[PDB]
Design an enzyme around this catalytic site. Structure first.
Site, PDB file in Angstrom:
ATOM      1  N   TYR A 100       0.868  -1.184   0.000  1.00 52.14           N
ATOM      2  CA  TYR A 100       0.000   0.000   0.000  1.00 52.14           C
ATOM      3  C   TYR A 100       0.908   1.240   0.000  1.00 52.14           C
ATOM      4  O   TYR A 100       1.687   1.439   0.931  1.00 52.14           O
ATOM      5  CB  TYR A 100      -0.899  -0.036   1.245  1.00 52.14           C
ATOM      6  CG  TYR A 100      -2.039   0.962   1.269  1.00 52.14           C
ATOM      7  CD1 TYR A 100      -2.314   1.775   0.171  1.00 52.14           C
ATOM      8  CD2 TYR A 100      -2.849   1.085   2.396  1.00 52.14           C
ATOM      9  CE1 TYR A 100      -3.369   2.689   0.197  1.00 52.14           C
ATOM     10  CE2 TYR A 100      -3.905   1.994   2.435  1.00 52.14           C
ATOM     11  CZ  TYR A 100      -4.158   2.794   1.334  1.00 52.14           C
ATOM     12  OH  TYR A 100      -5.183   3.716   1.379  1.00 52.14           O
TER      13      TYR A 100
ATOM     14  N   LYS B 272      -0.945  -1.603  -4.254  1.00 49.54           N
ATOM     15  CA  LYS B 272      -2.078  -0.687  -4.330  1.00 49.54           C
ATOM     16  C   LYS B 272      -1.561   0.713  -4.641  1.00 49.54           C
ATOM     17  O   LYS B 272      -0.858   1.328  -3.836  1.00 49.54           O
ATOM     18  CB  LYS B 272      -2.858  -0.671  -3.015  1.00 49.54           C
ATOM     19  CG  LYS B 272      -4.053   0.271  -3.024  1.00 49.54           C
ATOM     20  CD  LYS B 272      -4.760   0.266  -1.683  1.00 49.54           C
ATOM     21  CE  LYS B 272      -5.909   1.262  -1.648  1.00 49.54           C
ATOM     22  NZ  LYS B 272      -5.451   2.665  -1.865  1.00 49.54           N
TER      23      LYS B 272
END
Ligand SMILES: CC(=O)N[C@H](C=O)[C@@H](O)[C@H](O)[C@H](O)CO
Lengths: 290, 289, 290, 290
Positions: free
Chosen positions: D135, D163
């Site tokens: 992330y 992500k």
């Protein structure tokens, strides 16, 4: 010529059509010498609206300043430019006119690496029998150089110093310590006191055109270690600078000069023309600090 | 109509940094005959414009117009920190027959919106031509909003904008809000996503050698062959990545030299290509052309 | 309690498993009081690796600090974090422990507007019978408070000061002049001298844990207007800070502490365990400055 | 379990004092599954206001989400934070609960380097029998890794994807081309269309909590190369997102849920509460897009 001292970044007078007003420019020069009593003038810098002018105009201004000043005070010529050919030509021009030193802003717009920046500076200074001062001002160019890079530039013995107009007092302190033999000039008027305690050899500022006496006091008081008094002068100076910035920096300084009979005239478009409101504000500013 | 693919014209300079007219004309011919672009964007960053004197800028504008004639469209970037120069250049190029003019946002000094608007109005109101706004925060540091772009468009002679921001949210909003204005993508490596969002064309430095792939990306996308367009963008971005890591302007010129076009050098302080750079450029040429 | 003075941003001791080393923590504290001779400790700050600890660990640290210090020196508790409920709980906990004052960093990660930031501070200080100091640290947060916004916060009479950890000396000077009745703490160790000349009321620094003596000399020489001397101590201080940063800030400070007879231990992961190269470098730094 | 598709960054319901409102959370979850018909839920993300919560609360939310969802849709648990100790703990907790994959935001606040970021990710995933998704959040954390490092991270076969919640489409395109064997998730709702055109395998968004149907249309229609059709849906969706952003992102999404019988509750202070005006505005947004 010893280059230490207080230099006013020379403002230039323009008429409503954007043309240079020699009469006004010579009055601005006289004001700086006779009233502000600065040690010298930094000609062709940001404050002189230099980057908005043609090469011929830059040269005309260089001629007028040298002529009006004569040999009364020191002169530094900012000849830097994205056009290295123009920079070299201006370097030679100002050297032949007799400027005591030259200065050059780091090449901007394009994103040059250090190898290229070093080439830029060496090409300029190696083309003339003069001394060069590096001009940084990351605020406007976006070029933030490190200590080791400056160290590599200082390799050249003709590159005698730097005009640091960045808000990094860590780098400033580091440069003072690392290069005890080089000149370091503060370029941030509102932070003159903290810069002086770090050992700068003088200052170059836009506000000196009107606040040269107080500016000198901040410097000399600090060198005399009268810090309390220096701070008070910096407080007053920053009240003035704050009001000026809020009313339009260059336009207001010019209006302050107009109030004193110095025909500083207009700013170069697209820098806005002073509104009636800015004019009234300028008068109040003058009444509060002069 | 000004829509289409435009090469931000590279200029040929010699060892001394002087304009090489023959080489410039070859670059122009290569763009028209080999890259087959719809027009040239003269005097932009890619042309090393801001490192030149006003006299050199004018010569480049005249040479380009003379070589092109009426074969393809021409847009002249006349913007400068010196508004007087911009006006002079706008008049000069308008008299030469340039189809439109463009102007980068005044830089170096921090001008507010009111001053930027005066800058643009002053330039276009001085001539009988049309103006495209050049907004490049990456090199100037100026990023406007949707509302500001709106006030500028109050001048009917301002017909579009060259978008160089990575903000596609803004791009999407502008496309729908101003469906009557021209929007040009200015980031070669992100042409595909820009085209799907409605840009009317693109202006790029890499088209000087990659014009055919650039056109395929644009046209494939307009025909909804997004998958294939993405693959062309992949190959294109492999090339762009190699070029960027080897020296952008220098490598494109070397790629042109490999094809017999005398594109020459870049103006100092931009470095001269080293041996490693030259070898790499040959590898690049072999792999993508 | 008068909060003016030199405060060490207390570091915490951790074992290789990342568990708190109470003895080590107590030694760090004792070292700051008996060797560094600071006026107080700033507990729970960034330097204490606060944001990598669970709320219970934060509480144990606050308890150990107070127990170990007792009333020998002053104590300021940093209780802020992204979690407000935790902040209010810590403000209560520390106030009950008898901390002289509390501090709160600007909430980060999320982009909170000013109204939200203002409520964050009022909620914290209004929840207890104590006094609060603002902690800006824009370098790690990204939050840039303006002069007017600071003025809005200072409306609360219980908000007595601010820890200025931003290198904007223009704003610092403005703050000093605009809020002469509030405490202003310098948070940039490498810029202590210039900040002191602008009138700060003291300093809160991470390097004071191992360089408290020089830090005090810089502050005191400056207040005595012995600037040439202060600058020389700042030069050596920055040579040290420069080496520390290049070798790994927190790891090197703890390794330096180890060399000073304090079981500072390890930094908590993902902060890297010192490598052999880092360890020999830290010992070179030790022999050089201590 | 294949992890491709649309994922709602699960919003969490809180009471007046900021405590978790499990009844509201389960309703939000049911809404995402039954009405929005999303492929799965991304739990513990920024949208869940995760970084304003304690470890115990994070654990309760993971349990609530797993218990309410059962096996109807996929679940990804975000277990990252500044504290690595908490990360490993949450990774184990979540893996025991049966989450299909875990995710970890790049450690923030402190300025970690690549080596440390690498050790952080490897430690987390090597501790459990699960799969990991990186992330980024370059906008909130300020962490912009390059293509060469991501490549190093992906050396670990249990690190299945990343992500991208940053609009850097050049890097996105480079990632797609360089790692055809890894999953790439778009995290910017208003730009999921151009991101899908570049090959992302799914999307994780906060607005999907109420606009999951349109979001799926945009994703799938673009995947199917039905651009003109995908664009139509994107036009309305971005008008919706613009209205939401102008009325307060998290607050408005929760108000839109309440309009449908979902007790989404309060937001966690210092985030401002939804006012009567925001409620009135949200009602207009509701009538216009639903
Ligand atoms: C190269 C670098 O990043 N820093 C330089 C030292 O080498 C100097 O500028 C000082 O170390 C400064 O503190 C950091 O730049």
């Amino acid at each position: 010529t010893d280059m230490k001292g207080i230099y006013s970044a020379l403002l230039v007078s323009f008429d409503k059509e954007g043309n240079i007003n020699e009469k006004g420019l010579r009055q601005i020069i006289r004001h700086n010498i006779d009233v502000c009593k600065v040690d010298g003038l930094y000609v062709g810098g940001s404050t002189g609206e230099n980057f908005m002018l043609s090469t011929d105009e830059k040269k005309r201004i260089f001629e007028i300043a040298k002529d009006e000043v004569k040999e009364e005070i020191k002169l530094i010529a900012q000849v830097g430019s994205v056009n290295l050919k123009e920079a070299v030509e201006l370097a030679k021009f100002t050297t032949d006119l007799g400027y005591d030193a030259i200065s050059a802003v780091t090449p901007f717009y394009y994103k040059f690496d250090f190898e290229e920046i070093k080439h830029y500076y060496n090409t300029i200074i190696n083309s003339v029998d003069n001394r060069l001062i590096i001009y940084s001002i990351p605020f406007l160019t976006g070029v933030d150089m490190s200590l080791d890079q400056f160290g590599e530039l200082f390799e050249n013995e003709k590159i005698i110093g730097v005009k640091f107009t960045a808000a990094d007092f860590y780098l400033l302190e580091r440069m003072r310590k690392t290069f005890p033999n080089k000149l370091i000039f503060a370029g941030f008027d509102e932070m003159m006191l903290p810069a002086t305690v770090l050992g700068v050899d003088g200052a170059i500022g836009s506000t000196f055109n009107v606040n040269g006496v107080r500016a000198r006091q901040i410097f000399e008081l600090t060198k005399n270690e009268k810090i309390s008094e220096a701070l008070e002068v910096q407080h007053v100076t920053n009240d003035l600078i704050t009001d000026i910035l809020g009313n339009g920096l260059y336009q207001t300084i010019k209006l302050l000069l107009e109030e004193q009979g110095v025909e500083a005239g207009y700013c170069r478009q697209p820098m806005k023309e002073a509104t009636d409101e800015m004019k009234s504000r300028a008068k109040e500013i003058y009444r509060k600090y002069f």
